[PDB]
C-alpha cells in the first residue's frame, strides 16, 4: 500500500522544521471526544480528548479539514486539534449512527412511519443559540482582579495597588498593565448582525457604549502576541458570572478577606464619609464568596504581602514558562 | 501533710477538668480561638493598606519604601536585643 505509506510522514515533518514558529490567536474546546474511533489525521494521533476549555493556541493555516498546532505545558511539544468546521460536522456524526434519532422509537413499534430521520437532527437548522465551534481568547488568558468590594472605592482598589507592583515590577517581559474606563460587564460580542460603528448614522443603537466598549478589544486579544496577560482596572467586575460568558472568560483572582467580620476595622480605618453606600460594602463582599468557588482560579487567604505575593507568583511563575 | 496534700491537689485538679469539659461542650474556647486569628488576619491584611499607602503615581516614598523593608530585615531585631542587653547590663 503506497498510497498511505507515502503520505502518512506529511504531519510528522512539517510540525518540527519550523520548532521555532511564533503562535498566534488561540482555541478553547467545548467538547471532549476520543480519536479511537475518530481519529482521520495523518498525525495518527490518540485524540484530541483533552479537556473543555482547553488551554491551547493554533495559527498554522492548514487544509480546511484539521490543524495541527501546538499544546502549551511544561514541555514545549507539539499537539493537533480538530478544525472548527470539523467539529461542527462530527459533533453529530458520532450520534449519525443511533438509529432512533429523529422522532421513531425501537419500543416494538417498527413500522409505523419507518423513513430516515428528519433533517432537523443536523445542521441544516442548530439554532439554540448559534453557538459557534472553537472561540478564540488572547495569547494568553486575560486577568480580572475581583475583590475585595466595588473598585474604585477607597479601601476596595487600594487594595489593588498593593499586589500590583509585584506582577508588573516582577517580570518587565510579560506584563504590560493597562487601564480601562469601559463597562466589560455589560459588553458581549454575541451581536445579531452588526454593531454600532458610526457616530451620527442615527440609529436605535447609535448613543449607546457597545461601540466604545468593542473598541478595546484591538487592545486585547491579537495585540497580546508579546505574550503578556494584561490587567485591567475596570470597576465593572464583581460576580463571576456576566464575563465567564462570552470570548474574554479572563483570570480571576479573588482576595479573600476571611471571615466578614474583619472587614469591618478594615473598612472603617479611615472614620468618617466611608458609609456613603454602607450597606453595598460587605455583601457585595460575601456574593463573590457565594458563587461556585471554581469560578475564580486562584483564592489569596493569606497574610502580609510577602507571602500572598508569592501564591500570585507561583501561578504565574508555572504559568508563564508553560505558554511557550 | 504529704499524703492528704496529695489528696486535696488531686481533686481539685480532677474537679477543675469537669468544668473545662462543660465549657468544651457550651464552646467558650471558640471566642478565643476566633479573636486569635481574626486579629492575626486584622493585622496580616494592614499591610496591603500601608504598603500602598504612599503609593506616588510629596516625595516621603524616599524613606518610607525602605524603612518599612530596614526596620523589618532582621537588623533592627538584633540590634535593638543588644541595646536592650547593653540596658539590662
Redesign the interface.
Given at each position: 500500500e503506497s498510497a498511505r505509506r507515502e503520505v502518512e510522514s506529511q504531519a510528522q515533518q512539517q510540525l518540527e522544521r519550523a520548532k521555532h514558529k511564533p503562535v498566534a490567536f488561540a482555541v478553547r474546546t467545548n467538547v471532549s471526544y476520543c480519536g479511537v474511533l475518530d481519529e482521520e489525521c495523518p498525525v495518527q494521533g490518540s485524540g484530541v480528548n483533552f479537556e473543555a476549555k482547553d488551554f491551547l493556541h493554533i495559527k498554522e493555516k492548514y487544509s480546511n479539514d484539521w490543524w495541527i498546532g501546538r499544546l502549551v505545558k511544561e514541555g514545549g511539544d507539539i499537539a493537533f486539534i480538530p478544525s472548527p468546521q470539523r467539529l461542527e460536522s462530527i459533533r453529530l456524526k458520532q450520534e449519525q449512527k443511533a438509529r432512533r434519532s429523529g422522532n421513531p422509537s425501537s419500543l416494538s413499534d417498527i413500522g409505523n412511519r419507518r423513513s430516515p430521520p428528519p433533517s432537523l437532527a443536523k445542521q441544516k437548522q442548530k439554532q439554540a443559540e448559534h453557538v459557534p465551534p472553537y472561540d478564540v481568547v488572547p495569547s494568553m488568558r486575560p486577568v480580572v482582579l475581583v475583590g475585595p468590594s466595588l473598585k474604585g472605592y477607597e479601601v476596595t482598589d487600594m487594595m489593588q495597588k498593593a499586589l500590583f507592583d509585584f506582577l508588573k515590577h516582577r517580570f518587565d517581559g510579560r506584563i504590560s498593565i493597562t487601564r480601562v474606563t469601559a463597562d466589560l460587564s455589560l459588553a458581549k460580542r454575541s451581536v445579531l448582525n452588526n454593531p454600532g460603528k458610526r457616530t451620527i448614522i442615527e440609529r436605535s443603537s447609535a448613543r449607546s457604549s457597545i461601540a466604545e466598549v468593542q473598541s478595546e478589544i484591538e487592545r486585547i486579544f491579537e495585540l497580546a502576541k508579546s505574550l503578556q496577560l494584561v490587567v485591567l482596572d475596570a470597576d465593572t467586575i464583581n460576580h463571576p458570572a456576566q464575563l465567564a460568558k462570552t470570548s474574554l472568560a479572563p483570570i480571576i483572582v479573588f482576595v479573600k478577606v476571611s471571615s466578614p467580620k474583619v472587614l469591618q476595622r478594615l473598612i472603617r480605618s479611615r472614620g468618617k464619609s466611608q458609609m456613603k453606600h454602607l450597606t453595598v460594602q460587605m455583601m457585595a463582599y460575601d456574593k463573590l464568596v457565594q458563587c461556585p468557588p471554581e469560578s475564580f482560579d486562584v483564592i489569596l487567604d493569606e497574610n502580609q504581602l510577602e507571602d500572598a505575593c508569592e501564591h500570585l507568583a507561583e501561578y504565574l511563575e508555572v504559568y508563564w514558562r508553560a505558554t511557550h | 501533710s504529704f499524703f492528704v496534700l496529695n489528696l486535696v491537689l488531686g481533686v481539685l485538679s480532677g474537679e477543675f477538668s469537669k468544668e473545662r469539659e462543660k465549657a468544651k461542650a457550651r464552646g467558650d474556647f471558640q471566642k478565643l480561638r476566633?479573636k486569635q486569628?481574626?486579629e492575626?488576619?486584622?493585622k496580616?491584611?494592614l499591610?496591603?493598606?500601608t504598603?500602598?499607602e504612599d503609593?506616588d503615581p510629596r516625595w516621603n516614598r524616599f524613606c518610607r519604601r525602605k524603612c518599612r523593608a530596614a526596620v523589618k530585615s532582621n537588623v533592627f531585631y538584633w540590634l535593638v536585643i543588644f541595646l536592650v542587653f547593653l540596658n539590662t547590663l
Open positions: - | 476566633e486569628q481574626l492575626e488576619d486584622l496580616g491584611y499591610d496591603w493598606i504598603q500602598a503609593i
